[PDB]
Design an enzyme around this catalytic site. Structure first.
Site, PDB file in Angstrom:
ATOM      1  N   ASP B  25      33.277  58.290  48.512  1.00 46.60           N
ATOM      2  CA  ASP B  25      34.081  57.128  48.864  1.00 46.60           C
ATOM      3  C   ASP B  25      33.419  55.776  48.573  1.00 46.60           C
ATOM      4  O   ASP B  25      32.636  55.274  49.381  1.00 46.60           O
ATOM      5  CB  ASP B  25      34.388  57.268  50.360  1.00 46.60           C
ATOM      6  CG  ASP B  25      35.461  56.324  50.849  1.00 46.60           C
ATOM      7  OD1 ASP B  25      35.843  55.395  50.110  1.00 46.60           O
ATOM      8  OD2 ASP B  25      35.909  56.522  52.000  1.00 46.60           O
ATOM      9  N   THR B  26      33.787  55.147  47.463  1.00 44.89           N
ATOM     10  CA  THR B  26      33.193  53.861  47.111  1.00 44.89           C
ATOM     11  C   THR B  26      33.670  52.697  47.979  1.00 44.89           C
ATOM     12  O   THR B  26      33.049  51.632  47.989  1.00 44.89           O
ATOM     13  CB  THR B  26      33.405  53.520  45.636  1.00 44.89           C
ATOM     14  OG1 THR B  26      34.805  53.484  45.351  1.00 44.89           O
ATOM     15  CG2 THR B  26      32.732  54.565  44.763  1.00 44.89           C
ATOM     16  N   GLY B  27      34.756  52.917  48.724  1.00 47.94           N
ATOM     17  CA  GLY B  27      35.277  51.882  49.603  1.00 47.94           C
ATOM     18  C   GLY B  27      34.631  51.915  50.979  1.00 47.94           C
ATOM     19  O   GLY B  27      35.000  51.143  51.866  1.00 47.94           O
TER      20      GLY B  27
HETATM   21  C1  LIG Z   1      47.231  57.144  51.026  1.00 49.32           C
HETATM   22  O1  LIG Z   1      46.437  56.040  50.560  1.00 49.32           O
HETATM   23  C2  LIG Z   1      45.343  55.665  51.362  1.00 49.32           C
HETATM   24  C3  LIG Z   1      44.522  54.607  50.956  1.00 49.32           C
HETATM   25  C4  LIG Z   1      43.423  54.226  51.733  1.00 49.32           C
HETATM   26  C5  LIG Z   1      43.127  54.900  52.931  1.00 49.32           C
HETATM   27  S1  LIG Z   1      41.718  54.402  53.825  1.00 49.32           S
HETATM   28  O2  LIG Z   1      41.503  52.918  53.645  1.00 49.32           O
HETATM   29  O3  LIG Z   1      41.725  54.591  55.321  1.00 49.32           O
HETATM   30  N1  LIG Z   1      40.397  55.178  53.138  1.00 49.32           N
HETATM   31  C6  LIG Z   1      40.386  56.661  53.117  1.00 49.32           C
HETATM   32  C7  LIG Z   1      39.099  57.260  53.740  1.00 49.32           C
HETATM   33  C8  LIG Z   1      38.880  56.738  55.175  1.00 49.32           C
HETATM   34  C9  LIG Z   1      39.241  58.792  53.790  1.00 49.32           C
HETATM   35  C10 LIG Z   1      39.551  54.370  52.248  1.00 49.32           C
HETATM   36  C11 LIG Z   1      38.143  54.184  52.759  1.00 49.32           C
HETATM   37  O4  LIG Z   1      37.285  53.968  51.647  1.00 49.32           O
HETATM   38  C12 LIG Z   1      38.073  52.966  53.692  1.00 49.32           C
HETATM   39  C13 LIG Z   1      38.669  51.695  53.033  1.00 49.32           C
HETATM   40  C14 LIG Z   1      38.479  50.506  53.970  1.00 49.32           C
HETATM   41  C15 LIG Z   1      39.431  50.249  54.973  1.00 49.32           C
HETATM   42  C16 LIG Z   1      39.250  49.159  55.846  1.00 49.32           C
HETATM   43  C17 LIG Z   1      38.118  48.325  55.713  1.00 49.32           C
HETATM   44  C18 LIG Z   1      37.167  48.579  54.707  1.00 49.32           C
HETATM   45  C19 LIG Z   1      37.345  49.671  53.835  1.00 49.32           C
HETATM   46  N2  LIG Z   1      36.689  52.754  54.022  1.00 49.32           N
HETATM   47  C20 LIG Z   1      36.267  52.927  55.284  1.00 49.32           C
HETATM   48  O5  LIG Z   1      36.973  53.260  56.235  1.00 49.32           O
HETATM   49  O6  LIG Z   1      34.962  52.667  55.337  1.00 49.32           O
HETATM   50  C21 LIG Z   1      34.366  52.777  56.621  1.00 49.32           C
HETATM   51  C22 LIG Z   1      33.031  53.509  56.494  1.00 49.32           C
HETATM   52  O7  LIG Z   1      32.042  52.621  55.950  1.00 49.32           O
HETATM   53  C23 LIG Z   1      32.367  51.291  56.381  1.00 49.32           C
HETATM   54  O8  LIG Z   1      32.649  50.377  55.322  1.00 49.32           O
HETATM   55  C24 LIG Z   1      33.598  49.450  55.827  1.00 49.32           C
HETATM   56  C25 LIG Z   1      34.628  50.256  56.622  1.00 49.32           C
HETATM   57  C26 LIG Z   1      33.754  51.459  56.933  1.00 49.32           C
HETATM   58  C27 LIG Z   1      43.937  55.959  53.354  1.00 49.32           C
HETATM   59  C28 LIG Z   1      45.048  56.342  52.572  1.00 49.32           C
END
Ligand SMILES: COc1ccc(S(=O)(=O)N(CC(C)C)C[C@@H](O)[C@H](Cc2ccccc2)NC(=O)O[C@H]2CO[C@H]3OCC[C@H]32)cc1
EC number: 3.4.23.16
Lengths: 99, 99
Positions: B25-27
């Site tokens: 997960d790069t996000g």
């Molecule tokens: C159906 O399409 C979808 C698109 C996106 C998502 S999701 O955003 O919950 N997800 C998925 C991951 C949590 C499995 C992406 C993760 O990479 C998600 C994207 C994000 C959301 C809010 C704020 C910062 C970053 N990253 C995430 O939750 O990272 C967590 C863990 O590390 C920390 O970095 C900042 C937030 C924290 C869900 C569904």
């Protein structure tokens, strides 16, 4: 080119006349952006991640431009704390993870 | 190796001598794993996901193997839809985004 992961992989996209900064997110199935107006019909949807689920509007066949490439894909619009470019769009520009 | 994004970039990781599936997960800045047992003491951490903020357990200098590569770093344990490998560990195995 190669994008390091030392920092958040941010990019600027062009969508609906608007320019938005977003995170290249391999963990995101679909691209999710903060509230904005988009043309066409949409379907309500619930997406879940860390912290739970949020309700979004699903728009298909939306034109997006990243790094000079013009791609079409699904865009989920809702109260997301951060804009993320999902796998749905990244595949279209031939982006991959390498190690 | 190269991992395309047509399907979720799920990989096998080894932690505590057990094999588990995790999402590259790069996000994600951090690595967040489903409930499990880890040695030593933990510290509290507040992380914000798409659905809001949650409290997780932070364990440091934990050995974790990702795709055969040895890493030693911070692992967060808490309520998450799936094991997520963040940038903190991807940088340790020399992973980057390319296009
Ligand atoms: C159906 O399409 C979808 C698109 C996106 C998502 S999701 O955003 O919950 N997800 C998925 C991951 C949590 C499995 C992406 C993760 O990479 C998600 C994207 C994000 C959301 C809010 C704020 C910062 C970053 N990253 C995430 O939750 O990272 C967590 C863990 O590390 C920390 O970095 C900042 C937030 C924290 C869900 C569904």
């Amino acid at each position: 080119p190669q994008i390091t992961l030392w920092q958040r992989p941010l990019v600027t996209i062009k969508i609906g006349g608007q320019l938005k900064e977003a995170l290249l997110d391999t963990g995101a199935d679909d691209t999710v952006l903060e509230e904005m107006s988009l043309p066409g019909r949409w379907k309500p949807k619930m997406i879940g991640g860390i912290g739970g689920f949020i309700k979004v509007r699903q728009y298909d066949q939306i034109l997006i431009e990243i790094c000079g490439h013009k791609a079409i894909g699904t865009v989920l619009v809702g109260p997301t704390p951060v804009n993320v470019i999902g796998r749905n769009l990244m595949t279209q520009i031939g982006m991959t993870l390498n190690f």
